[PDB]
Structures are given as structure tokens and as C-alpha cells.
């Protein structure tokens, strides 16, 4: 069954389109004959247009509001099968030339949406007396139903396709479904066909790039949630449209919105904040630097020569972790933070400087730069830092500008416990607390390879021994909430699916 979404384009794309997952947007010559069911609304804007096999209009989308059958300004338009418009209101307006349609009622083709049924310009339906309205009401809708209410796998009608994953009482866990079927359009599919992906809902779609990302866990591409900002290859300063750009001014800015993996080498320069007259760019607003907070990888060198004076650290690069030196400044340096006014270095994420060296000079008020052990950051043995001309180490120690004692001697990007390459005790995600909340604390987390991992929220804290041995409801040792078998769960499974989608009562 061909599936689709100027006129000639849709004319040659709807030539077959037995079932349309989008909308019958026939706008502005008899190219369609077998459009059985449309999963959406029908933007039909014309005299001789069969539309004979159009049976169902699901109204997944609308022109303005509940506009299922939108028309305007078609006597020979026999939509004789258009006898049930599901979840939509017929917008059958401005029909001056349409004939034989006035005699037939326009409401039985709709169900429970007569409030939004306005119409203005026993009984036969369309052109020619050979066709009839074929009343059936005054679960099949348009006329083992031929067309189902929600989902028709092969011949049967179902409100929901068999889920791709099914609870298994044998393993005391919610498992995958051996008979798992992806709900593609109105038909369940053992495997998602037409090279489509596995959407969060289970409804196969060919574009899941909005608020999500594409991931291949099995033989079929599957769309998963965009963990923070997901991957977005983006051109850097010197490669691409910015080939001859000299910095991230107020022109190439925004072009870096949600740009995660910069494919070039960023050129933060004083000319960016001052603005450049020759290149016709206005001064860069310091608040616009938060656009660069999305960067997590630079396959080049991150050169920073100017920062807003109201900012005491590199907050715009707090998510920058990689500075892979495919292109290097002066052939030696990848991170080139030079002559800034940063009190703390601020690169609390920076963990992998692969190729180039590091020069951190002119930071008259940055002390923690020398404290870091940069042998861990370097990815090769030919790299050596050039941290000189910073704030005096002796004066820094005397003034107390030394980071927390709750940090490993490995170093630190700043005074806050968030900014520390390694911490003396265990670490709570971004930060590193004095100790995990093993016995005292609200999060009541647990130690995992020297890292605080908060226990599953549906397990109650234990005030005698450790709150939970491992992450997840199973490993929690105390559970005031209900428990499913030997594991913890939110509530007992009641409305679940079994061998034939049976409601497993389970236990009380």
C-alpha cells in the first residue's frame, strides 16, 4: 500500500497512494482512484475528480480547527465511500458548482462532531444515480471490518496493536514481546517496514529528528530521546560557510545554536566582542555566548582570546569536553585560552585534549590553571602545557584562592566543588560531596566506582544500613511503596497485556 504525505508533484505522488499516513491535500486530472483510507484530514480544493475510494478521514491534522473535509469554490466529485470521517468535523463550505451533494445529508459522514459542522455553498450521494449513500448506522466506520476504528493489522479490527514489548510474569519483570508488532499507520507490523524507524509511541515515522535522535540498537533504526543536546555536526571557523570567517561574531552566531560537534575550530576573538566594521558585523552580545554552551566536541583547536569581563570563568564552554586537534593554532596548541579575565578556568567538563598542547597565558586573575594535572587530559605524548603569566601561585595560596580540600590533588578548574578534575571522596554527579548519602541525606544515594548514584525514587530510605545497594528498583533494600515479586515497582500491574492482551491481576 503506497503511502504519501506542486499539484503535478502530488498528482504523480498520489497516483497510487492506497493509504495516506498524512493528508489528502488534493489542491488545484483524475490521478487518484484507490485512496482507501487517509490517516489525517483531506484538504480537497478541486469538476471531474473521482475521489471514489476515499473511505476514512482520521483527522490527525486540520486546516484551521476540526477541518476534516475542507473544500472551497466539483459536481463530478463522487466521494461515495466518504461515509465516515473519524475524529474530525466536515468543513464542507463554499460548494457553488457541486451538484447532487445538496440533496444528500452531510452529517452521517461524521460521528459526534456536529458542533463544528458548518456547511454552506433516500438521497443519492454523488454524481450519477448509480451511486448511493449506503447508510449503515442510522468496529467498521466507512460502510473483520474492511477499515478499523484505530488499527487493522491484516483483517481484524483493533483499537491498539500488540505492543512491541510485553510484561512477563515468569521473569517477574516487564519484558519484550516475542509477538511485538510496530503500529505503522493502521496496520500492526511484526518488523517496522518501508525503512521507517521505531518512534517512542511505536508509530513508525521517517523523521524523528525533533526533540529526539536516531539510534540503531537492533537491525532496525530506532528513534530515542535527545539526551540533553544530541549530536549535530556543525561547521567551525575556517571550515564550511565560515571558511574565511575570523571569529564567532554576531553574524556566524545563532548559526551555532544547538551546534554540538563543531567540525572546524572556534575562534573566540576580541574582534568578536568589539565587532568588525569591514566584515559588516555588530558587537557580539556577551549573553549570546550561551549559544556556545551546547558545544561538546571541537575537532580542531578552541582559541579563546576574549571573554566578557562580567564572567569570571568560561561558562559558555562548561559542556566542552573534547578539543581533538585536527587543526591546531600555530601547529602546537589546541586549547589556547589567552589573556582572559577569568578567575577560574571554568572548563569543568574538558576531559580529552587529544592532539595539541595547551597555552594558558595572560590570565592575570586565574590561579587554578596550574593546579590541574594535564597529563590526564593529553591524548598523546608530544603535548606539553604552557601555563605561564597567570596569577601568582604564592599570592593565590595566601589569599585563599585555592579550591576545596574536598578534591583530589589531581587538580581543579575552579574553587567550587563542581570544578574539580578528581575529588578526594566520592562525587555526586557534577559536584563531589563530602560523602555519598549512604546513611544521612535526602537523596540517599550509593557509591558506584567513586560516584554518587541516586537510588530509585520509589524505594524508601533505610536509617539502619545502606539505603540501596545498587541503582534501580530491584537493588533497593527498603521499599515502603508496593513491590512486584522480588523487585520494587510503582504500583501493582493491573491494566497490562498477556498472552492475548489479558489483564494480569498478578497479586493484591
Amino acid at each position, epitope marked *: 500500500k503506497k503511502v504519501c504525505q506542486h499539484f503535478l508533484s502530488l498528482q504523480r505522488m498520489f497516483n497510487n497512494c492506497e493509504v495516506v499516513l498524512g493528508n489528502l491535500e488534493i489542491t488545484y486530472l483524475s490521478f487518484l482512484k484507490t485512496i482507501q483510507e487517509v490517516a489525517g484530514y483531506v484538504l480537497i480544493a478541486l469538476e471531474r475528480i473521482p475521489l471514489e475510494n476515499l473511505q476514512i478521514i482520521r483527522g490527525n491534522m486540520y486546516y484551521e480547527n476540526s477541518y476534516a473535509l475542507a473544500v472551497l469554490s466539483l459536481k463530478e466529485l463522487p466521494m461515495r465511500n466518504l461515509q465516515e470521517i473519524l475524529h474530525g468535523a466536515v468543513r464542507f463550505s463554499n460548494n457553488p458548482a457541486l451538484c447532487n451533494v445538496e440533496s444528500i445529508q452531510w452529517r452521517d459522514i461524521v460521528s459526534s462532531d456536529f458542533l463544528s459542522n458548518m456547511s454552506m455553498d433516500g438521497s443519492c450521494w454523488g454524481a450519477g444515480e448509480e451511486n448511493c449513500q449506503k447508510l449503515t448506522k442510522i468496529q467498521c466506520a466507512a460502510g473483520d471490518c474492511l477499515v478499523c476504528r484505530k488499527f487493522r493489522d491484516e483483517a481484524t479490527c483493533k483499537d491498539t496493536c500488540p505492543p512491541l514489548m510485553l510484561y512477563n510474569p515468569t521473569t517477574y519483570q516487564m519484558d519484550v514481546n516475542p509477538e511485538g508488532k510496530y503500529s505503522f499507520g493502521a496496520t500492526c507490523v511484526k518488523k517496522c517496514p518501508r525503512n521507517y524507524v521505531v518512534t517512542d509511541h511505536g508509530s513508525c515515522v521517517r523523521a524523528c529528528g525533533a526533540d529526539s535522535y536516531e539510534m540503531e540498537e537492533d537491525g532496525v533504526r530506532k528513534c530515542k530521546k535527545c539526551e540533553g543536546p544530541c549530536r549535530k555536526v556543525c561547521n567551525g571557523i575556517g571550515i564550511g560557510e565560515f571558511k574565511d570567517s575570523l571569529s564567532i561574531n554576531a553574524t556566524n552566531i545563532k548559526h551555532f545554536k544547538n551546534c554540538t560537534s563543531i567540525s572546524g575550530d572556534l575562534h573566540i576573538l*576580541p*574582534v568578536a566582542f568589539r565587532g*568588525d*566594521s*569591514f566584515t*559588516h558585523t555588530p558587537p557580539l552580545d556577551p549573553q549570546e555566548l550561551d549559544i556556545l554552551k551546547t558545544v561538546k566536541e571541537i575537532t580542531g583547536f578552541l582559541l579563546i582570546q576574549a571573554w566578557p569581563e562580567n564572567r569570571t570563568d568560561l561558562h559558555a564552554f562548561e559542556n566542552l569536553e573534547i578539543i581533538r586537534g585536527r587543526t591546531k593554532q600555530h601547529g602546537q596548541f589546541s586549547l589556547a585560552v589567552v589573556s582572559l579575565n577569568i578567575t577560574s578556568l571554568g572548563l569543568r567538563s574538558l576531559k580529552e585534549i587529544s592532539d595539541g598542547d595547551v597555552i594558558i597565558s595572560g590570565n592575570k586573575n586565574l590561579c587554578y590553571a596550574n593546579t590541574i594535572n594535564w597529563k590526564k587530559l593529553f591524548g598523546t605524548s608530544g603535548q606539553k602545557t604552557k601555563i605561564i603569566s597567570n596569577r601568582g601561585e604564592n599570592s593565590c595560596k595566601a589569599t585563599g584562592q585555592v579550591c576545596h580540600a574536598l578534591c583530589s590533588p589531581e587538580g581543579c578548574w575552579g574553587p567550587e566543588p563542581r570544578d574539580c578534575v578528581s575529588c578526594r571522596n566520592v562525587s555526586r554527579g557534577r559536584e563531589c560531596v563530602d560523602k555519598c548519602n549512604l546513611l544521612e541525606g535526602e537523596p540517599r544515594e550509593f557509591v558506584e566506582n567513586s560516584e554518587c548514584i541516586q537510588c530509585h525514587p520509589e524505594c524508601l530510605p533505610q536509617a539502619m544500613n545502606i539505603t540501596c545497594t545498587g541503582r534501580g528498583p530491584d537493588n533497593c533494600i527498603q521499599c515502603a511503596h508496593y513491590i512486584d515479586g522480588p523487585h520494587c515497582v510503582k504500583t501493582c500491574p493491573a491494566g497490562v497485556m498477556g498472552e492475548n492482551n489479558t489483564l494480569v491481576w498478578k497479586y493484591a
Partner: single-chain antibody
Amino acid sequence: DIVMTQSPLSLPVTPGEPASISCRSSQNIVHNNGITYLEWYLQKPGQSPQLLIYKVSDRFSGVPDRFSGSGSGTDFTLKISRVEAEDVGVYYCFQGSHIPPTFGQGTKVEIKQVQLVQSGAEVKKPGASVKVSCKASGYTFTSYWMHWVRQAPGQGLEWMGNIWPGSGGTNYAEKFKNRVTMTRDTSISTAYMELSRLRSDDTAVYYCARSGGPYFFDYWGQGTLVTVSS
């Protein structure tokens, strides 16, 4: 280029009078970003040009409020409510919105720290090459475009190109695309200008102006006159 025609030419003004110089552009001085790059550069007789109205109607720091400017579309003008001996000189209605900057004809008004040190004046022969140096001190050299403006005698200022000391990128003008070479020595902070294939009409004063933030040629060099004849 853009013909920056000026309504008055060599206009003489008596002191204490509202002088007005109107300059019109062949094309609309309006850029995509929406800011009109129109500037009025004071060039005192035998002196490096200095900016006055950094915009169509703004004012350069250190320039008194006596100078004013107003205009829209293609028609612009400059207003000088009070004129003194200082206001004497040549005013160049400059445009930056168009890719090649172009100065006006030159309305010579008459009567009816950072410093860029240039080289010395030299006299060469046609077909030779003249390197023109411009030492830069007082600012971060690899942070400002090193523009290379020229002023042919008996003619308005003609742009010839620039160079970015940070990366060495140069943008020669179309008339000088295949004739000139703009280099620089970062270690010792000068930018040179090797103009090869000198010609009879190539005599000019090659100012090494420095592009500012929202205005062009914020600073300038003294000017290296290069007279060439056979």
C-alpha cells in the same frame, strides 16, 4: 564600486556658520544587518584622515558635538553648526556597507594610546616594487584588521586592501587584486605592503588605517607618499 557623489565640492565656509555637506551614493547604503556604514573622515591639510561621524548620525570619541550627520537611503549629509579653524580640511563621505569600501570625491572645506608609525616617503621608477611598512604599537596587533587605504593626488581616497595579522588573510581591491601584496611580521608587530609593478598613476599616500569596532579606519599611519615617474 559605489559612486559616493557629494553635493558640494571644495565648499568654503566662514567661521561660525552652519556648514552642510551632502553626499549621495549610486546604490542604497543599507546592509543586511540593517546598520548604514556611512562615515565622515576629517583629513587636515598634510595630515592623516581622522574619523568624525562614525555612523550616518553618531559621533567619534574625542570629536566635539559641533559635528553632526543625518541621512537615509542614498541621500546623506553632514551638519557643522559651529565651524572653527579646526573644522578646515577635507571631508570624505565614506561607505562600508558595500563589499569594497569607497570614499567620496572630497569636499575640501575652506574659508571664504595607540599609534601606527609608517615608513618614510620614497620615489621609485615605473615597473618597480615599493614595500610600504607600518609599525603598530599600543594595542594587540593580532586583533585588528590592518587596512591599507591610498590617496591618489587630485583624487579621493581609494581603498586598496587590508590584512589580518592573526592569520595573514588579505582582501585586495579589484583594481589592485593582481598587483599588490600585503604581508606582516607578527613577532615584531608591523604589517608591510609590497606593491609590485609600479605605474605612473600609482603615486599616492598609502595610509595604513586600522579598522575599528563599529567604524572603519579607527586609527591611521602618518602616510607614505610614493611618487613614481620616468
